[PDB]
Amino acid sequence: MVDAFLGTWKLVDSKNFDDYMKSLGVGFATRQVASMTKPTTIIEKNGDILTLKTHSTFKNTEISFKLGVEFDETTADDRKVKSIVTLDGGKLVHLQKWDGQETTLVRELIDGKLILTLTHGTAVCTRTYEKEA
Numbered sequence: 001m002v003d004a005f006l007g008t009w010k011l012v013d014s015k016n017f018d019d020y021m022k023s024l025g026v027g028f029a030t031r032q033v034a035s036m037t038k039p040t041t042i043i044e045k046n047g048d049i050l051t052l053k054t055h056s057t058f059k060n061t062e063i064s065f066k067l068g069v070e071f072d073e074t075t076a077d078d079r080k081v082k083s084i085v086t087l088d089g090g091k092l093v094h095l096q097k098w099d100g101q102e103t104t105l106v107r108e109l110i111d112g113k114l115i116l117t118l119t120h121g122t123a124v125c126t127r128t129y130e131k132e133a
């Protein structure tokens with residue numbers, strides 16, 4: 001079910017990430033660095049447990065979760081959130097909740113590319129990742 005998402009992925013296109021970060025309250029200097037960073041995202045499975053790594057020089061993250069089971073998460077920008085990841089329409093949907101706010105991180109496969117759509121407030125960011133061999 002999750003298997004076409006698995007592997008190592010490299011950022012190849014980003015649209016509106018500054019808008020998304022600004023909506024989350026990320027400061028200007030951090031948004032500069034982020035705007036020039038191309039993370040590597042690694043998605044692995046071991047039974048029911050998925051592990052999603054995001055690697056870059058200035059910041060790394062890692063989460064492990066079971067689909068459909070809430071987990072605590074501390075995001076790259078240091079929000080402490082309540083998270084759940086599910087499959088919806090073949091898309092891997094990650095919902096984060098904190099302080100009565102929400103943001104969604106939706107991953108969809110289109111023509112072999114992984115499209116990540118990030119929504120917070122009115123801001124909608126689209127980032128495209130391509131699979132490493």
Ligand SMILES: CCCCCCCC/C=C\CCCCCCCCCCCC(=O)O
Pocket residue numbers: 011021026030033034037039041054055056058059060061075076077116127
């Ligand atoms: C873990 C790498 C995240 C992207 C590079 C961040 C470089 C600047 C370092 C710290 C600031 C964190 C900034 C924005 C974090 C917003 C929430 C996570 C966005 C994930 C985007 C992605 O996976 O492509």
